[PDB]
Design a protein around this ligand. Structure first.
Ligand SMILES: OC[C@H]1C[C@H](O)[C@@H](O)[C@@H](O[C@H]2O[C@H](CO)[C@@H](O)[C@H](O)[C@H]2O)[C@@H]1O
Length: 342
């Protein structure tokens, strides 16, 4: 009842900086998004004003601070989440390479695995995706923390709908012009199911994805993130040899950085929102679950410990009446219930 679950994937963000490591509070400082001649301004990432509606127990930390990473891996162990699904932006800079290596090293000390969450980086296309999959497997595939499921790496592909199925086929069909199938670089490729089945069923089949996930922590944001659709999505997945990895989260709020986005707020209700979403994933009969998120602090979906904080600039939300580690321990509860169902 305490072991890590390697079919549980927690979305992790490595984009935070601190003065101690980076010399700058990266991402804690963040531009405010205009509402789709506005000068919306910027959150400055001071102690008092950070780019989240909540406040981290660990403060304005650096994702490159090995001592922070240690603490994060201990949190993953508490939550029983065996796979860290690492955001990857193809930054092509030494700081990215350093951070990835540190995260792998810290993860391995606690038997945590790492897979990549391939983000919509500039000019992303199936050719540079192939080149990047090769790069990541070549660089990190022999690291002991690199995740494999039945011998294959696994990648989540955010906003996979931005690429046509005719392009995906070239990479993901066994006959595709630039296929990874049957190569040293074959992998489980998990696309993002967004909209209705009439659109998503043929997309997923014609793209040759191995599976699909839903990402959004806010129920009802998309068809795919509406949990009453999960039973039918799982039925279709099983019928079509696809792996469904629904995404569950504890809440959503991003109004510090998107003040116009209040309709997407989902209240945590002392854990009852998380409970409801996790229960629906397990009841759907799925073989794997993803958690949005460990630490997307901008979106207020994090399970990472948060503390009460009132500053001169903002009164932050917090977990009270729950303790700061409540979402870690509640995750461990649900991992157990999920394992009971496997
Ligand atoms: O990891 C996938 C996706 C998850 C959320 O929709 C965002 O984290 C998004 O990043 C965008 O929004 C961030 C703020 O919420 C912003 O900091 C990033 O620069 C954006 O790219 C992720 O792509």
């Amino acid at each position: 009842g305490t072991e890590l679950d390697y079919d549980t994937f927690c979305f992790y963000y490595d984009w935070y900086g601190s003065e101690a490591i980076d010399g700058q509070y990266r991402h804690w400082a963040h531009a405010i998004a205009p509402d789709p001649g506005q000068n919306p301004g910027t959150i400055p990432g001071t102690q008092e004003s950070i780019a989240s509606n909540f406040y981290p127990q660990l403060g304005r930390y650096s994702s490159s601070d090995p001592n922070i990473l240690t603490k994060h891996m201990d949190m993953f162990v508490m939550a029983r989440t065996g796979v860290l699904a690492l955001t990857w932006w193809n930054e092509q800079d030494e700081t990215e390479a350093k951070r990835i290596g540190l995260i792998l090293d810290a993860a391995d000390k606690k038997k945590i695995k790492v897979c990549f969450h391939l983000e919509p980086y500039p000019s992303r296309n199936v050719q540079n995706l192939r080149e990047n999959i090769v790069k990541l497997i070549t660089r990190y595939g022999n690291h002991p923390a690199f995740y494999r499921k039945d011998g294959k790496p696994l990648f989540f592909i955010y906003d996979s709908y931005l690429i046509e199925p005719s392009e995906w086929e070239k990479l993901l069909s066994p006959g595709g012009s630039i296929t990874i199938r049957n190569t040293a670089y074959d992998a489980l490729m998990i696309g993002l199911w967004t909209s209705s089945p009439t659109v998503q069923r043929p997309f997923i089949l014609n793209a040759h994805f191995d599976g699909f996930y839903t990402y959004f922590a806010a129920t009802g944001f998309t068809y795919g993130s509406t949990p009453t659709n999960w039973v039918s999505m799982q039925k279709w997945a099983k019928e079509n040899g696809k792996i469904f990895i629904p995404s569950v989260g504890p809440g959503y709020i991003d109004t510090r950085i998107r003040p116009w986005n209040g309709s997407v707020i989902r209240t945590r209700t002392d854990g009852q929102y998380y409970d409801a979403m996790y229960r629906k994933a397990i009841e759907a009969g799925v073989s794997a679950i993803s958690i949005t998120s460990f630490n997307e602090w901008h979106q207020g979906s994090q399970i990472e410990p948060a503390v009460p904080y009132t500053s001169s600039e903002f009164t932050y939300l917090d977990y009270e009446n729950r303790e700061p580690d409540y979402y870690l321990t509640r995750t461990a509860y649900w991992v157990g219930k999920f394992r009971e169902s496997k």
